[PDB]
Design a protein around this ligand. Sequence first.
Ligand SMILES: CCNC(=O)[C@H]1CN(Cc2ccc(Br)cc2CC)CCCN1C(=O)c1cncc(Cl)c1
Ligand SMILES: CCNC(=O)[C@H]1CN(Cc2ccc(Br)cc2CC)CCCN1C(=O)c1cncc(Cl)c1
Ligand SMILES: [Br-]
Ligand SMILES: [Br-]
Ligand SMILES: [Br-]
Ligand code: NA
Lengths: 303, 305
Amino acid sequence: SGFRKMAFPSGKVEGCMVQVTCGTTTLNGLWLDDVVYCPRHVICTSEDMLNPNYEDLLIRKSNHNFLVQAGNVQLRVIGHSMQNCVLKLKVDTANPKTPKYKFVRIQPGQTFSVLACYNGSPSGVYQCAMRPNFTIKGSFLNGSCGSVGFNIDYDCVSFCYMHHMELPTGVHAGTDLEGNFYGPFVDRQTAQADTTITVNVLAWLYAAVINGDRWFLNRFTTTLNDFNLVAMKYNYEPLTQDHVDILGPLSAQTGIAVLDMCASLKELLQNGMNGRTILGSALLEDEFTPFDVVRQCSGVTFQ
Amino acid sequence: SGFRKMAFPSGKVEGCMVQVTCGTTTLNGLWLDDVVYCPRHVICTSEDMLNPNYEDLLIRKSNHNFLVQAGNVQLRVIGHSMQNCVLKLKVDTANPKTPKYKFVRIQPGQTFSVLACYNGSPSGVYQCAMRPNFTIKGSFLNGSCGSVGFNIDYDCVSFCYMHHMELPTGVHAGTDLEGNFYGPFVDRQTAQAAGTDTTITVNVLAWLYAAVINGDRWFLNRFTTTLNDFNLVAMKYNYEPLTQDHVDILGPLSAQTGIAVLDMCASLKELLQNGMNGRTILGSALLEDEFTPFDVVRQCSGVTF
Ligand SMILES: CCNC(=O)[C@H]1CN(Cc2ccc(Br)cc2CC)CCCN1C(=O)c1cncc(Cl)c1
Ligand SMILES: CCNC(=O)[C@H]1CN(Cc2ccc(Br)cc2CC)CCCN1C(=O)c1cncc(Cl)c1
Ligand SMILES: [Br-]
Ligand SMILES: [Br-]
Ligand SMILES: [Br-]
Ligand code: NA
């Protein structure tokens, strides 16, 4: 029993974190095989940040303008290139701790673990979701750029996020490991200013039932259309048939039809909790996916 | 910016997890140097668990009764003993990945990271607190026994918890790594209930400081209070007493924000008496009590390991 924000064990990613220096700037890089990946804004001065021309900034650099430190060891850079908004530094040592890995670009609503790092050294691990507005609500300070997000299903590290910047509202923006930003954002200090992830809230209500609580259910059902008309009034994302399909295994394990759980959520939005909690929370939680619930919860419902 | 429940990086601990088998039971062990530590209840059959005589049950066991697997490698058991509620298995191989470590017994209110493991394999990491009633609100399934909790203190893994059992209410009980239980619990399948829990006051204050650091200020007010008056309110609301030591421990956060602890205590007093009036703090509608003062400083200052 129990239900926690549960990250992946971080060791496989810890063994890949390095420090990258260009000029007076230091940030984190990801060392996989003989390549180090990092945000390309490492090549910018403070002045460069409003309207950088990365091609013009990069052409002026040699390999030896980049320093890479792995623990107490300097790695020699023997090539460099830019792919979208990431810099790739070829180094003369392959990382012996490289895990089995892949790069995946995720969709809004998906979750991942973040290993927050400073100066190439891991500080902590926490769970995040890609918000509907393509930001993440991270916890990041000066020096955190190049920290990554990942999942480790089936003993393969799937890297899905690299941290690039904090927006004025205090939320976070970054890229996939091919250097393409999530959302409309750009690696420029220019103005570039969310909803609740409905499918995740439903998943978490299923978790609550699996773990033994049913107080929030009701005798009603809903059409999908009526559910969306109501939920959108509370700034919830539309629930699609794909979402309904993804909830199928949790529905089967609990005996609660997806549209019946939708009816329960409609009523929770109308009524509140009447002083109760669900899985320890007094608000509806939206950063657990259906897959995350199946990962963490028992396969047997506490009936 | 931002504030998350944050665990320590788990890699140093991952390299210590092994699988221990005794008869039909498999659970997790912690492999440090040439010793594997696990719950002593691994030696019990279901019948034994109802009223075990561990002295006698251990006498009936030999080295040959235990199997230890580290990944795909069998470690040969060459000695065994128990210390309190922990079984110690001496193995033929020292763990080459043994980190610098200590065994530390923590106090109620302190937090730690849990590496949840199954079949000797790490599955997930989360942050917990030792509750005032000496339980933890963990997340554990069948096979999780022997999972450990830890902090990293400077350069050193401080192991503080080993998981033994789930109580009827769904919360968790276990020992320090010297096998001493937290709380009035025993490693027997008999009726057991924790005391009514209370809220960890010093941690709530730490989290209000975190909220201020992160720009959430609506609950500040012109008032102060005394330690005596504050504790009358704490007691009324099922909060732990605030001691002068707690005030001292909050010193760095008080210094960083410029808000005296007793000033913040007046905020908390008003929140307890009036509720939040529909507002949230750091996204929560509850007063969060599983961040220590040090947890707030660690996260707000970017301490690495
Ligand atoms: C808090 C302002 N700083 C940052 O956002 C970042 C990134 N910044 C560039 C930046 C900045 C705003 C925008 Br819009 C675009 C761009 C892209 C050109 C340079 C300094 C490093 N830097 C950080 O170290 C950092 C990261 N995450 C959280 C925090 Cl508090 C700091
Ligand atoms: C859910 C019942 N199971 C458990 O509590 C434990 C421990 N149990 C013994 C037990 C049980 C309750 C008490 Br009181 C005392 C004792 C004597 C120590 C044996 C089976 C292994 N076992 C687990 O694998 C396990 C762990 N954490 C969460 C979950 Cl769901 C399971
Ligand atoms: Br996805
Ligand atoms: Br995968
Ligand atoms: Br909450
Ligand atoms: Na005040």
